[PDB]
Every structure is written in structure tokens, then in C-alpha cells.
Amino acid sequence: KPWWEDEWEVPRETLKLVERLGAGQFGEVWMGYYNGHTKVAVKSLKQGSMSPDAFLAEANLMKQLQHQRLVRLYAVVTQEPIYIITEYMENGSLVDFLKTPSGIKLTINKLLDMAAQIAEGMAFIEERNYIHRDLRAANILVSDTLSCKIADFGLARLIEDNEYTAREGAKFPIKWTAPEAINYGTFTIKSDVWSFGILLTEIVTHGRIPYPGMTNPEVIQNLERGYRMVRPDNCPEELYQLMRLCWKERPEDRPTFDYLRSVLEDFFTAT
Ligand SMILES: COc1ccc2oc(C(=O)c3ccc(Cl)cc3)cc2c1
């Protein structure tokens, strides 16, 4: 729909940018208000840093994935500078939150709860025929009520035929990315399942970098030998075995996100 018909379009006037939360190569993230009373996050595009088409493609994709477990698109302003306005998550990113004093006092019981909420969001994405491609604790946001939601849908893609193949030159974070995607550019929901395994390590270690004290070439090499990430300190063995399922050699052997959800809920009502 054109801007004058789009229900997500709002006049820039409805928005007040209050607190700058981040700034990068491609623009800024703010805490702001919509119509005076409603707290929102506002992401702004720095002109010329990147295509306005590429920027807005994130919003158009969030028009197709609306669920409680996923950061919701609130609105767009499609005139320069371009704004994407989303659901505000008061506790910021999972990776930062688990390091704060509140984050530090969480029981293993609440961590497993939070892991099940994330699996539940990814079960929606899986069922809708999408992939995320960037699933990691930096991209799970936490609310004021300590509930979690999937965020940052910049790399998210609809799958018609099973695979999305990346370009020959494209680079992805070696520690969070499934081998087949790093190696062949091929992504599937089963690649996100591999990422979820890594994300489980970050939950149980309060946001520590995966594969403690290894470089990327060491990680790739260990994996090819059949090794997997060393048992993180104070990791229940049940959860460690759930991570191993996510890291099965063959994509098709890795579990569904709905299986991961149900196992995690069992782990949690048992603690
Ligand atoms: C300064 O730390 C914080 C605290 C709270 C915070 O909330 C957010 C968000 O809600 C958010 C929402 C959507 C995007 Cl695309 C990026 C960030 C970012 C953020 C950063």
C-alpha cells in the first residue's frame, strides 16, 4: 500500500525522541513517546549510509510476523529521515540484561523459563515459513516483566522452496552460525536451530562469548573433528544435551523449535 494508505504510516509530529539508546554507521536508536504517553523505540536511518529500500524492508517483514513473542512493529515514517518505530523493551537486550544485578540473581529455573519463551517465538517463525539468520542473545529483548521476545529482523527471510542461499561474498558471525550457512551460504530453519544452541550457552553463562578462549579458525577446526562447545560452567547436563541436539551434523537431524519449546517447559516446571 502507498504511504497515504498504509496503516503503519504516522506523521513524524506524533513522535518525541527523548533518550538516545545507540548510534552506529547506519543511524540511531532512541527511546521516545508516541502521542505523548506511549513509550516506543525509534530507529532512524542516517541518509546516504545505506539504501532507504533496504532499511524499510525490515519494517515490511515485521508486517508479516506479528506474535506476542516477537518485537512488534509500531509504525513507520517513510520521509527522510526514515523512522522504523517498534515495541519498547524496558530491559534492553538479553545479553546486557543477564549481566546487570537483576540479571545476576536469576535462578536456573527462570533462565530455562526465558529459554522456553525464545523457543516459542522461534516456533512461530518456523511455522510461518520464515528464518531469522541472526538469532543470538544480542537479538532477544527483555520486558519490564522479564518476558523475552525475538528482535532484529534485518536478515529474516520468507522461505518458498526450503532454502535461502546468500551471496558468495557475504560474511556471518562464525560462532553463532551453523556450518552449512558459513560454508555454502545456505540457511534454513535448522540453521536457526543451531544458533539457538549457541544462544543457550549465553543464557547459562550470563552472556559470555561462546567457545571460551577460542578463535574462529580454532572453532571451525574443532567442529570438523566432531567436537562441540565444552560444557559451560554450571550448566545442567540436561540442557547441555539439548544444546547438543541443536548441534547435530545433519540439519534435518536437529529438532523442531516446537520440540525445543516443549522440552524447555518440562525442564522448567520440573525446577
Ligand atoms: C541502553 O540500553 C537499552 C535499554 C532498553 C532498550 O530497548 C531497546 C529496544 O526496545 C529496541 C527495539 C527495537 C529495535 Cl530494532 C532496537 C531496540 C534497545 C534498548 C537499549
Side-chain angles (χ1 to χ4, degrees):
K1 294 180 190 186
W3 75 253
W4 61 84
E5 267 167 18
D6 188 352
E7 40 289 308
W8 278 278
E9 190 81 28
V10 301
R12 180 179 332 273
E13 290 75 46
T14 63
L15 301 166
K16 180 163 197 191
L17 280 60
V18 180
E19 204 199 314
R20 191 171 93 194
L21 297 193
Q25 229 196 294
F26 307 118
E28 314 184 294
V29 177
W30 292 73
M31 185 273 286
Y33 290 93
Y34 172 82
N35 281 189
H37 293 112
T38 307
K39 208 152 192 196
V40 296
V42 181
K43 178 155 96 168
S44 62
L45 173 57
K46 180 187 220 182
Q47 288 111 303
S49 60
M50 64 177 278
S51 160
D53 187 66
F55 181 80
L56 285 180
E58 197 181 356
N60 293 328
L61 193 139
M62 306 167 74
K63 294 176 202 179
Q64 314 317 344
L65 280 168
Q66 305 169 62
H67 189 272
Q68 281 307 129
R69 298 273 59 83
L70 278 56
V71 178
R72 186 194 175 271
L73 183 70
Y74 193 102
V76 294
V77 173
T78 59
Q79 107 222 134
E80 308 200 335
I82 312 211
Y83 290 177
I84 292 173
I85 307 93
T86 63
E87 193 173 11
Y88 185 74
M89 304 295 294
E90 179 79 55
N91 280 320
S93 96
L94 180 56
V95 81
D96 303 317
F97 172 76
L98 278 186
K99 283 171 184 171
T100 68
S102 293
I104 287 169
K105 283 156 220 156
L106 301 188
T107 57
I108 184 56
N109 173 257
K110 184 59 190 179
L111 294 187
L112 290 167
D113 171 16
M114 291 192 155
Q117 308 192 13
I118 295 164
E120 189 180 326
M122 291 297 310
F124 182 65
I125 299 172
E126 165 182 283
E127 190 269 336
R128 294 316 297 159
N129 283 341
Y130 284 77
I131 40 169
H132 188 284
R133 294 205 302 147
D134 207 8
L135 176 65
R136 62 190 286 172
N139 298 335
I140 310 305
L141 301 182
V142 183
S143 66
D144 69 311
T145 66
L146 315 178
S147 64
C148 291
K149 301 194 187 199
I150 321 290
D152 193 0
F153 294 98
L155 304 172
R157 299 296 187 262
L158 177 63
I159 288 325
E160 47 300 302
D161 281 292
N162 249 25
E163 286 187 352
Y164 168 96
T165 301
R167 154 194 174 96
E168 206 91 300
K171 72 267 87 207
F172 311 93
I174 287 168
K175 294 176 201 221
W176 282 263
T177 307
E180 70 267 16
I182 287 161
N183 285 336
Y184 311 140
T186 51
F187 288 85
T188 80
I189 197 62
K190 297 298 191 202
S191 304
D192 289 340
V193 168
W194 181 291
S195 298
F196 185 83
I198 305 302
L199 195 162
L200 295 172
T201 72
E202 303 173 272
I203 290 173
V204 85
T205 63
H206 298 277
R208 182 195 200 184
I209 299 166
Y211 300 96
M214 301 168 48
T215 59
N216 295 337
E218 296 175 304
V219 177
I220 291 167
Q221 161 161 40
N222 264 226
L223 294 180
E224 292 185 339
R225 294 190 76 183
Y227 289 166
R228 289 301 186 264
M229 196 180 309
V230 169
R231 284 186 181 82
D233 285 329
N234 298 301
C235 183
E237 181 70 9
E238 281 163 289
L239 182 68
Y240 187 61
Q241 291 302 326
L242 200 64
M243 306 165 172
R244 296 197 72 92
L245 292 197
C246 298
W247 309 321
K248 282 225 184 212
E249 196 64 12
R250 300 194 297 146
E252 65 262 39
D253 296 338
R254 310 172 192 156
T256 69
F257 272 114
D258 204 77
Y259 174 80
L260 291 160
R261 190 206 39 98
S262 68
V263 165
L264 286 162
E265 286 171 20
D266 279 341
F267 279 5
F268 139 67
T269 63
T271 68

